[model samples]
Target chain A: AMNSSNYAELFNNDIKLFVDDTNVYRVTVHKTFEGNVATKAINGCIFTLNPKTGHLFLKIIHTSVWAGQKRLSQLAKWKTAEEVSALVRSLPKEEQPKQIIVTRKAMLDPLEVHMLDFPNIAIRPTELRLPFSAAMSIDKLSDVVMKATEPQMVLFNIYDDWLDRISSYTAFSRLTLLLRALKTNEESAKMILLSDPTITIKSYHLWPSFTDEQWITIESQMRDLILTEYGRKYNVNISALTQTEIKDIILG
Target chain B: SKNEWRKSAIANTLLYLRLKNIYVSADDFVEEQNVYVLPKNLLKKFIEISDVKIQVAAFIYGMSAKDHPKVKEIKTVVLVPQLGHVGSVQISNIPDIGDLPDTEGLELLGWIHTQTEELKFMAASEVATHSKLFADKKRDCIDISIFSTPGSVSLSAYNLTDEGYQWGEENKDIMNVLSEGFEPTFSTHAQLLLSDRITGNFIIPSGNVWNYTFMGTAFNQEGDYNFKYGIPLEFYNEMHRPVHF
Candidate 1:
């Protein structure tokens, strides 16, 4: 995987490596998406996408812990012709996009070494922007970025320890409102809350003898209410989850 | 808040048994009564009793107006127990025809019943059985589905208010549908006649259902009776709640 000098590279069936200034990453090969969402692999991270009107589900997997500081990938000035050739050579022939975006910026040296040889496949850093201003307006995202080299418009895990981020009532309320606005704006986009799934449904408690006519609807509403309220919130659609998903995600 | 379902159920079962030329006693009822009645109180208690066995199954469910039977005669029955459905006469062992408690129990049921059914409400019943059945068990419910269904052997934690005991003999059918649920028949205790090691199992309609709140910060299932009844039913047993509220 040492096709680059600036950052280490790992690739097999999924993953195009390299992080740019942008706050987003891209992927294909459906299988990785499943592994990421189900969390059979990615651990200690949160994964989901900014509501982008759904060309397809774009799940963004990120590290939840504050693992010190991650330096930006500086421009790869030093590069040997042989190193770039090997990096390009390592890529699967059928599909090598013009560029690869790094999820982790610190691991860019090995990658920068590869950029030395490959002139055609330019190495562009991820371009990220604080989508929302301090004033708190509607109709945008937070901490999401775009792959600079990818053509056309479009975008795309487990950010564990995330439960802490949403661990407050006010934070939850904000997230709730945030999701609400996203969903309203993007009709096709649906939010999948990779969350701590225990007790997602607040109404399982058979109290006051729940006698609602439409129990299914109420049950869904109850679970959503459990989200984003009182220092207790989770993924947006925690309502439509299985018990197994909750246990595995929360416990693991 | 309070339970009146089982008492009325007992009172009613005795009446039906009487019509069949049978008698239900204290022990049989998990009770201590030959039966008691005031004139207005008598039929009133009988009505209270009669409604229970027939509720959920008949006589009408919940608190519906304009459909009461022997309405004019209710005041006469309890207006003055120790008197059984076998006989409504005011006996010496029972109290004199008089007023009743503040508002609870059979008297409360009687009061609510009379008031809701027609205009001749509380005035007549108090005029009937002056002495109240200040019974021992302050809270509980009983059922005689055993007598009717044969092997049904009901559980102890039960209710008699067909429309729903905690629901009220008065308004709202909310708890009625729930009554078909997890309705226990045991008063303090009852046999599971049919069982393995887990004999005390009583599957009532689910009333105490809980919500799924995986992310609840202070989520404590404490003192929460609202549990799942299927596979996890046994799992929740003796398990302390996790949240504070």
Candidate 2:
């Protein structure tokens, strides 16, 4: 039943990539295999994060070293993994958080999800997220019919059933109702910087392009597009500038 | 070679320093020379803290839409506390101080690091191509991923219109701070906070303003932490969401 431009939903399930309706930070790792040697490309970045709070530490490996582009300068300016870590290590101790979770998109020989520091859990995808999608799906799905709603027993893949509970018991109406209502807020709790359905006003900034710049001739062009509510060029003389001093000047 | 990158590094550092000595002639802009309907003397320096935060996040893209978590709006700005090698256009975030009404929500305005080696702008046409493919309407603002270290100028501003503010294209090459020919566009971005717009309020649906929600480098449904702290992380095998940052 497929037509020329028709796409099919190979996996039959609604995308549910949140836990308690909270978004999870998934990760991808890039690797190269040549002969028996395995290597990770320079243009690689990997990270692990908490699904609930979203705190994370990333192990970023610069990847612009390939030969596809014209510029050779960039491929050389990249840093190593240790350098990236050292940059973070330079931060104040208090600012450093211990929780660093790393994730892998799928199984790879070069990237064994090799155990990172303890408590720094690493996850490598073993298979295509078949049932209950973790975080993403490609097909645009129309409103799905639940086909059926039951007031009785329900089980998630992670939840195991107690022998007698599912036998014939009805859920407490009030308890079930509370969980249902509470879950909606959790699902909608994300902060999206999109057109606000709630508020009518939207805010934005401006950035125009520069086409012609030879010099002294700018006077006429400057007048052509006038300036308003603006600030003149200013930076504290740094040799004479301290953090607080610069802050004081800038805050003014 | 190391020598090449080192040159870039020094140039980047020197560029930041040189940016300080820039001065525009006061006679350049006059009362009669007004671009907007409500034009007046824009002040000397008045950058909003929130604006800095927005730009900082905008610099870190190529992530999922699910990233910015629990953040409302940034209302503070912080310049990098300490200085690093000036080879690249590097920035850092300063810590905080005693609680004051003015200093309540201070944060560092650590946005883009100018790749001194490559001061060229991220081609506008490239962004337009992405917008055309992903963005459904022209109303949707396109990203202008500019990577520069050279300065003596900044231009993320424009003239206001009934729709939104319109950002003009860069007529002059940023590399040539001292123009040899006539520059087509003005050098500075029009900040609307020095004195005040003679118009009404800033609450009108962005008048001739270029606006769009920014995407973080892989958003978190739980937090807003990125930029120098950002790295690309792929979670799903396939990017199900059509727009990835």
Candidate 3:
């Protein structure tokens, strides 16, 4: 009795993915395959990464359920365990290890990771760079998408839980990421200025350029890696669409 | 203008209370501005002090609530060698000072008196005697007495509503009634001295215009022995005025 429309609505609103140089995408399918159920979905905004190559696809998934509520106090306990399971799978790694980085504030505290079953994603200096800022940017993007779609109420429900979790996580993650990025960017700028004694790097307006082929390759590689990793770890049968299927989905 | 002043005062009071680690209900004052409310336990402490002990008790109780327990009781024998009217006075036999325990109570009293003297608003002798009187009052009538002593002298005893000098005369019988009703009776004249000291009268300054300012009731309790402490208006004055020295 589960409806595809409900599934589709959930995917489109709650989940989002951003590849290196592509528009974000939403999940459009909700079906059972050999007893495996794809109950939740994510989607991204449509944007052409390269005019010559065509549009690129991004993959985002809903991860956690009991996110925003204060620790242990549950408003909706029925969906919590399942939501937690989904969250574990949705993490960047294959297996939900004993503990994952639930928060950046507790990143330095090893005790926090105890008894937690999630992948241990390394907190790279780059990842920590302005993580919270990046999260805010992502939230703004989410708001824009929700406003523009004005989708059905069912679609709203599917996204409600996912958006809450991702937004909360990203708020912290993006802040840390932004800080790392800024630090690295500053370092790079300093090095560039040092190399070019005649030019002040701070004064110079530096804009890096990427070729169409380069953009396409990066996008495709990122998507392939993510799908493969997710599929291999969670036993989720996520595969790239054939050229025909792509045409059918987009054009139809 | 009244609303603005109230808002600022409330905000400052909230900040002060927060620093003191006293959690206040946000909803309590958001609904009404003029009303005052105190946490229940604090109200109990306020209700227990008599006029003579109100200032010192307030200071000590506030400090105690802050987790600093440093008061004591001492036994002293007053020897009049110069006058040759030598009478050994055991502090323990003296009603007000005798009943308190030696270690924490006495030490805390000394410290409280010292702080009061340092403030220069009240003398140490007055502060010590006030505490003794407060204990005595509690033992006597079992009726709570609220004393607003720091900036003003305002005393109110429970169970007596009429404003008349005859009330004090009737207070002795009331004390007997209280003792019959489980309230302790004064054993010695020293204890009686403490009671008289607290109940002593003071004349309000003539020509001084008094402002009917609503002070937050920092404490409140419901029994005949229950009392409440009004937030001193001087506290707000000190809080808002800019310090130059």
Candidate 4:
């Protein structure tokens, strides 16, 4: 019934919108999040604060953040943006600092977005230091990288050549196996793989078999591995590299 | 190095069949390096004779790939599965060299047989048979073990190591020698090929009961005794022969 071109002028009967005390706009969407974990609405919320200005922040919703649960259970609340903001509002004002809580720098950087929301707000680097000296660090990183990536190269290369021979369903399945073997955790690798237009509905049918937690584990581990490998090759921390760049290092 | 082609061939062939829903992998082949190229018809026939309750045996007939005769490439093009155990009482009803079918011109490249379960190794008796099969120096024969499951079939190819072959020659009169010290020989790099049509059409007899009965004159012996209550069955027309060891 609410079909007006101007949303603010029409003013829907059930919907409500307001600004919280923190001066962040709020939408009263009482409905629970919908869809399967892969296509779910709730996982994408980013309650990002303006680090420098501190007065303004954006609560963005996208189907891009976390996929599954910390692992799902019966009573757990779906992380709707509305529910998340309510939880945010309940926190003590002094304790509500919003710096990026990256547990592992190597793993976190690949998932970090450089710019999000409109007006081009840039995400500041984590500003962490490597444990070893510059010259010595490359030596140690390369040691682990070569051991992780070499054995997998043959099988992955052969599978790349062999993919054309199989249906996209089986092709994706086998590639999943190969990635799992490599302990790949990059969702971008998976997303990049799905980006191929040639993939059919048969391949899409396999999406449900992969859980978000499984991909999270793969993404974390593979990011660490690639971070080490790239660092070894270039003798520098390329943490600012995009997911597509990480994927090229992985697929090649 | 000797059987590198076999490893590649089996990997390639398995990839093809795997795409068609055949459940086979390169891991199933293990240490096989000897490659044998088989026609779809011959491979299916081998599987058919193999899908029975008890064990079965057959002879493989083919010539070497002429491109590199020095480096052996045994191409198995025909299979003559044993219809009835004809000659040897000494070797537990194993058909004698003479009692086996004629190969016409093709060389006897190898032998194949099935076990009751999915065991893919050369048993003591199998090692002995392989030893005899390798007796003809010109042949460089191999052994195949067929492991057919309910809806799928897998096989492994093998041949004696130089020491295993020599051990067999040294103990020619013995029957079913233990394959302990000769363990390394069974790990010959071998490859396998099978038909998806054969895999799809495969039928496991009801409750492992094969009721098909043969009705023919016992040429070496006599006529038939009065019989009743025979099971219904089907048959295939004449097609595919061989003798060595």
Candidate closest to the true structure, highest lDDT: 4
RMSD of each: 25.9, 28.6, 26.1, 23.2
Candidate 4 residue lDDT tens string, A1-252:
111122222122321221111111112122212321232223111223211222222233322323353532211212332333443455575444333322123323222332122122121222222111111112222233224421111101212333335443344333433343233323223333333233322321223233335545544644565566567767876766556444334333
Q: Which of candidates 2 and 4 reaches a greater lDDT?
A: 4
TM-score of chain B of 2: 0.26
After superposition, candidate 2 runs with Cα above 4 Å error:
A1-252, B21-123, B126-151, B158-245
Candidate 1 - chain A - TM: 0.23
In terms of docking quality, model 3 is incorrect
Model 2, A241: alpha-carbon shift in Å?
44
Predicted structure 2, TM vs. truth: 0.18
Angstrom error of the Cα, residue A121, model 4: value is: 52
In the range A1-252, model 1's lDDT, one tens digit per residue, is 222232222223332433322222212121221243211111111112211111111223233211242431132211112223443575586544455543334434555665655566554443221112111111112223222222122232111122343333232223333333333222111112212122232232111222234323433543343333312343445445445333122111
| Regions more than 4 Å wrong, model 4 | A1-252, B1-34, B64-105, B136-139, B169-186, B193-245
lDDT of model number 3: 0.24
Q: Is candidate 1 or candidate 2 better by TM-score?
A: 1
lDDT of 3 at A38: 49
For candidate 1, what is the DockQ-based docking class? incorrect
Q: Is candidate 1 or candidate 4 better by TM-score?
A: 4
User: To one decimal place, how large is model 4's interface RMSD in Å?
Assistant: 19.2
> Native-vs-model 4 lDDT?
0.36
Local lDDT at A84 for model 3: 35
Per-residue accuracy of model 2 over A1-252 as CA lDDT, tens digit each: 111111122112311111110111122232212224333232222222222222222333333333364433332222222332453455575544333211223222222222232233222232221112221110110001111121111112211121124221111111112222222221111111111223321112110111124211322222211111011234324345344422122111
DockQ-sorted candidate list, best first? 4, 2, 1, 3
